[PDB]
Design an enzyme around this catalytic site. Sequence first.
Site, mmCIF file in Angstrom:
data_model
loop_
_atom_site.group_PDB
_atom_site.id
_atom_site.type_symbol
_atom_site.label_atom_id
_atom_site.label_comp_id
_atom_site.label_asym_id
_atom_site.label_seq_id
_atom_site.Cartn_x
_atom_site.Cartn_y
_atom_site.Cartn_z
ATOM 1 C CD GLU B 210 -1.805 -2.411 1.706
ATOM 2 O OE1 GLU B 210 -0.630 -2.871 1.726
ATOM 3 O OE2 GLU B 210 -2.770 -3.011 2.220
ATOM 4 N N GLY B 240 -3.917 -5.524 1.146
ATOM 5 C CA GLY B 240 -3.346 -6.865 1.309
ATOM 6 C C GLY B 240 -4.335 -7.856 1.880
ATOM 7 C CB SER B 261 4.871 -8.710 8.949
ATOM 8 O OG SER B 261 3.560 -9.130 8.596
ATOM 9 C CD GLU B 288 12.156 -16.602 2.135
ATOM 10 O OE1 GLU B 288 13.013 -16.446 3.008
ATOM 11 O OE2 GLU B 288 11.788 -17.752 1.798
ATOM 12 C CB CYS B 322 14.053 -8.303 6.676
ATOM 13 S SG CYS B 322 14.962 -8.316 5.091
ATOM 14 C CB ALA B 478 22.389 -9.559 1.099
HETATM 15 N N1 LIG Z 1 12.879 -11.850 4.642
HETATM 16 C C1 LIG Z 1 12.981 -10.818 3.802
HETATM 17 O O1 LIG Z 1 13.698 -10.908 2.608
HETATM 18 C C2 LIG Z 1 12.335 -9.491 4.078
HETATM 19 C C3 LIG Z 1 12.602 -8.415 3.221
HETATM 20 C C4 LIG Z 1 11.910 -7.208 3.349
HETATM 21 C C5 LIG Z 1 10.948 -7.094 4.340
HETATM 22 N N2 LIG Z 1 10.693 -8.169 5.166
HETATM 23 C C6 LIG Z 1 9.710 -8.037 6.240
HETATM 24 O O2 LIG Z 1 8.617 -7.260 5.832
HETATM 25 C C7 LIG Z 1 8.034 -6.590 6.942
HETATM 26 C C8 LIG Z 1 7.746 -5.146 6.547
HETATM 27 O O3 LIG Z 1 7.014 -5.106 5.334
HETATM 28 P P1 LIG Z 1 5.425 -4.799 5.351
HETATM 29 O O4 LIG Z 1 5.167 -3.916 6.526
HETATM 30 O O5 LIG Z 1 5.038 -4.415 3.962
HETATM 31 O O6 LIG Z 1 4.816 -6.231 5.789
HETATM 32 P P2 LIG Z 1 3.289 -6.712 5.740
HETATM 33 O O7 LIG Z 1 3.310 -8.149 6.094
HETATM 34 O O8 LIG Z 1 2.417 -5.925 6.608
HETATM 35 O O9 LIG Z 1 2.781 -6.555 4.231
HETATM 36 C C9 LIG Z 1 3.489 -7.168 3.171
HETATM 37 C C10 LIG Z 1 2.544 -7.316 1.986
HETATM 38 O O10 LIG Z 1 1.507 -8.212 2.331
HETATM 39 C C11 LIG Z 1 0.247 -7.608 2.090
HETATM 40 N N3 LIG Z 1 -0.677 -8.163 3.077
HETATM 41 C C12 LIG Z 1 -1.011 -7.676 4.326
HETATM 42 N N4 LIG Z 1 -1.901 -8.543 4.878
HETATM 43 C C13 LIG Z 1 -2.119 -9.565 4.001
HETATM 44 C C14 LIG Z 1 -2.900 -10.728 4.031
HETATM 45 N N5 LIG Z 1 -3.555 -11.120 5.132
HETATM 46 N N6 LIG Z 1 -2.877 -11.571 2.946
HETATM 47 C C15 LIG Z 1 -2.112 -11.307 1.823
HETATM 48 N N7 LIG Z 1 -1.337 -10.181 1.811
HETATM 49 C C16 LIG Z 1 -1.338 -9.330 2.869
HETATM 50 C C17 LIG Z 1 0.445 -6.099 2.202
HETATM 51 O O11 LIG Z 1 -0.551 -5.362 1.510
HETATM 52 C C18 LIG Z 1 1.837 -6.012 1.587
HETATM 53 O O12 LIG Z 1 1.705 -6.036 0.187
HETATM 54 C C19 LIG Z 1 9.030 -6.723 8.083
HETATM 55 O O13 LIG Z 1 8.582 -7.721 8.965
HETATM 56 C C20 LIG Z 1 10.281 -7.204 7.373
HETATM 57 O O14 LIG Z 1 11.198 -7.904 8.192
HETATM 58 C C21 LIG Z 1 11.362 -9.354 5.056
#
Ligand SMILES: NC(=O)c1ccc[n+]([C@@H]2O[C@H](COP(=O)([O-])OP(=O)(O)OC[C@H]3O[C@@H](n4cnc5c(N)ncnc54)[C@H](O)[C@@H]3O)[C@@H](O)[C@H]2O)c1
Lengths: 516, 516
Positions: B210, B240, B261, B288, B322, B478
């Site tokens: 968003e 999402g 997340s 991830e 992350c 990375a």
């Molecule tokens: N492991 C990795 O490579 C990595 C990399 C970048 C970010 N992250 C993680 O991402 C998080 C931050 O990103 P964020 O705030 O956008 O995370 P988020 O989980 O809130 O949202 C991520 C995506 O999922 C969508 N979403 C939300 N609820 C959903 C649902 N129930 N079903 C399907 N999609 C849904 C959102 O609209 C967004 O597009 C942190 O926890 C971070 O550690 C991990």
Amino acid sequence: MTVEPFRNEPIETFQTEEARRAMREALRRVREEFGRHYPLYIGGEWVDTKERMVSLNPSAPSEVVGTTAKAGKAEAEAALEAAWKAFKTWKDWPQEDRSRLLLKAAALMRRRKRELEATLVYEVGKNWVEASADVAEAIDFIEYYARAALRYRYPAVEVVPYPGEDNESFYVPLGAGVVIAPWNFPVAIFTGMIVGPVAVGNTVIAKPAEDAVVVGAKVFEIFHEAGFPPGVVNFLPGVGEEVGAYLVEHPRIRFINFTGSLEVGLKIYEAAGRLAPGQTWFKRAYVETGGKDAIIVDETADFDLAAEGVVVSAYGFQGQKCSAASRLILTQGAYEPVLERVLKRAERLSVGPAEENPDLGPVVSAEQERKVLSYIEIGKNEGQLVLGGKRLEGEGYFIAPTVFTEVPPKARIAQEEIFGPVLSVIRVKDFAEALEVANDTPYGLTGGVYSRKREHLEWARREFHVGNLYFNRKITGALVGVQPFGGFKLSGTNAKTGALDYLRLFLEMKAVAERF
Amino acid sequence: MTVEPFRNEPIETFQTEEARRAMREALRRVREEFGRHYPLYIGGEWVDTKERMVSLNPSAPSEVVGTTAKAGKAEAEAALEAAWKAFKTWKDWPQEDRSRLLLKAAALMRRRKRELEATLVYEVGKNWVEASADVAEAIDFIEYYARAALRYRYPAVEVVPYPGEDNESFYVPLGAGVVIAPWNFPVAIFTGMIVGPVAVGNTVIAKPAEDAVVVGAKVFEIFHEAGFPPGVVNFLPGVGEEVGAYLVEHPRIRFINFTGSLEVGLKIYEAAGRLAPGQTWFKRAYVETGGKDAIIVDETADFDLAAEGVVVSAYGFQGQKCSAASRLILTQGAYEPVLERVLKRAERLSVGPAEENPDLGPVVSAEQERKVLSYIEIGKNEGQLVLGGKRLEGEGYFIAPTVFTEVPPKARIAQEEIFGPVLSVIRVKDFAEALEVANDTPYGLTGGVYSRKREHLEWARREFHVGNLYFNRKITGALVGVQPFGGFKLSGTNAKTGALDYLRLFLEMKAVAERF
Ligand SMILES: NC(=O)c1ccc[n+]([C@@H]2O[C@H](COP(=O)([O-])OP(=O)(O)OC[C@H]3O[C@@H](n4cnc5c(N)ncnc54)[C@H](O)[C@@H]3O)[C@@H](O)[C@H]2O)c1
Ligand SMILES: NC(=O)c1ccc[n+]([C@@H]2O[C@H](COP(=O)([O-])OP(=O)(O)OC[C@H]3O[C@@H](n4cnc5c(N)ncnc54)[C@H](O)[C@@H]3O)[C@@H](O)[C@H]2O)c1
Ligand code: NA
Ligand code: NA
């Protein structure tokens, strides 16, 4: 480690007097031991229980072939502790040392092949060559995975260099997992699913199918003699929906390696997707499930060759194979010539006690008999019965080779896995329609085409959507190394057994950079 | 296809006048373009909706960077139809043709790099170098996956030959899947998760976060100009928990590629394990998720080097990574010297509107600000606040670099991912305890060790259980190809991005035997 290039273990045909003599001797030794009780194997020792599992001879089910201990929740917990404790050190063995351990187990298995084949004959009703193929496949998995594991050894990952740094990526095993195995290949698949993960440093709790607990125990005798450290492999015969489900759902089970029915595979995959209370990882689950496999024959085929391959594929081990041809799809020009030949061959097949090396032994259990007979009843309502469709005389679960014709593609007997000697024949207009009918099931495991027309074969190569496709030969008996085995769609997760890719499923990768 | 060996796209530091001038002009043009509207992209055309998504400038949230259309169920259905239709022919493109399409997209993205960096500055509050790293990583994913995909081309599988037969095993793409992306690397991770699957013949429905919908649209402008066939890539900005969840749960979605997340990842992985009504496969889901990443420093380290790398890892992009160092684990001998240096460096960090190229811009949204401030309040009752801990003056979401010390290892601020500029300092006796504390979280993404002691480094190589580990350098950033990226435990499924293994996740294998 340097060993000879992998070759498949020859499948005994018993055409020599020595081979037949050796088989009779093995059958005698095995039946003299029908009284035996086999405990659980946990943390390097045989551990007995109060309750027991009984294994019957499906050719004579009043005859007990053996009993085993019966694992419940407490024994599952004991096995978990042992496997996680062993993992801490087993993961640190040089790959060469783990691979040598597998090679020893293979050599021990090869030395006991007639005994294991005879156990298959009496416990699960395989005829002699079916039993030999099963054991040879188990040996193949051990030999193949021993070698394949070396391809992943420290540090195996190809990475891009960066100035002033060492960048090193490498594989590590996952932890302790559960293997849940079927009764239909209870040496081959049981062995493969255990030794693949173990080879690369995982530890395993193995849950054999209820109908094949004795032969599973004998595989563990081999593992024990080979000298796997305590806790690396554990043997927990017991009830699938009890001890099996308990391990699948456990927060401390790292992965699940399952081969069995779609019904059960669906529950396992769903459960694996859940975070159990206190669980600290995303579980990996590999589920390799059933098929509704077809052979297509067109009017250009060698009809005699096709008929022979169809009969082998449909009725080998009484059709109790995930790879078995349960559908025969015939184009209009192929219909009468192929059906007549299939009927002539199938009506000549012998059925009886497995030890007599009939074309067909019994189905594996009273429950299987009930299921297959129920499907025959359904089939009588859906298509035309033209051969067999009856139980045969005797206490053993003998069912006649069965053929239904005029079967609608969407009929239950054309869609659902019967897992018995029941072939459904479907007439189609042309090759295009044959492919449409072939593809229109929920499954995608094996398939075959008999045809001389190059364009039809190559079209099927691109469009007959099954994981293991065979042209102008039987669709069963995939050989380790030669034909990576595993399906598409609801035939499972496409974990390709007997392939280099299999071991990757039981590894995760670490990347470590040092800036100097 | 023959191209130059892969090299990483250089990250601009803006130290030359030419670079500053180029960036100033790009920022000016993006700012002049505030308020632009971007439609959905479905089946090769831009498609508008009545409802919209609004994207604010976190440095000045009264300012609207842009709006997009908003995808609901009908748009998801239209995208599914387009993606499956496209898959039928896209899967049959020679790999060389698909790889050339990626290389074209990379060239187009490179030519627009300043504009994309400027868009990140305004839309998600990255300073200039953080923006440049993000765009460079996106370009790297395209360049890397274009080349890696060739390693899987027909027929790629190594198999054992068999007399009288051709045995051919090869990879095929899965189908149409959904990509669900985070706001924190909304060019790099958005691009990588789309182009990897697409390179090997899958089709994708992409759901940008968003807070990052505008820059996602600009990536799609690039895809459109490059000429991906209609339906191969589709752009569905939306909620999402609404359109994202709808696609995750859909019986016709083949795979899910998710980065975000842990909370959401858990829901997605669970839903993926379920068979939706009429679904005909086992869904693949890659999730991830977050981290609670630590840097260990022992008494042998270069303390000045350590303090710099800790400050970079903890506060780069406001700790919204992350991979960010959210824990600093100091042995007794390192505690005072390192903490002193970290505090002195961190108190000099500038905070302001991202366009000014401060050390820290704002956090991304009012909700993120609320969560970080809430964690600061929690922290005040768990550890000792020694720096920051406040919202700064201004309309933008500015939070001061924050440090808590003498934090209990099991404290909420030592265990839970805060995802803001908040560092928790943990004092331990020695390197052994440092490793215990490092490992004792639910996560396992990134980690670092500053030490000159070889035995401590090599011990961490073996036992510091994180997917991406770095010695004597920062733990963020990375690089594609150099450091396969992805974690253990509740940091996700260990899908290693920027590695050869990544593309295998989006393929299944077929084995075809012809008996001659
Ligand atoms: N492991 C990795 O490579 C990595 C990399 C970048 C970010 N992250 C993680 O991402 C998080 C931050 O990103 P964020 O705030 O956008 O995370 P988020 O989980 O809130 O949202 C991520 C995506 O999922 C969508 N979403 C939300 N609820 C959903 C649902 N129930 N079903 C399907 N999609 C849904 C959102 O609209 C967004 O597009 C942190 O926890 C971070 O550690 C991990
Ligand atoms: N895809 C393949 O490679 C392949 C190979 C061989 C057999 N199969 C399939 O196996 C099936 C026949 O084998 P089966 O009858 O042993 O299958 P099954 O599903 O009934 O049982 C398989 C194993 O799962 C255990 N089990 C049963 N319920 C369980 C539960 N709810 N939780 C955990 N474990 C449980 C059983 O005890 C047994 O050990 C056929 O569908 C066949 O197609 C597939
Ligand atoms: Na039996
Ligand atoms: Na925004």
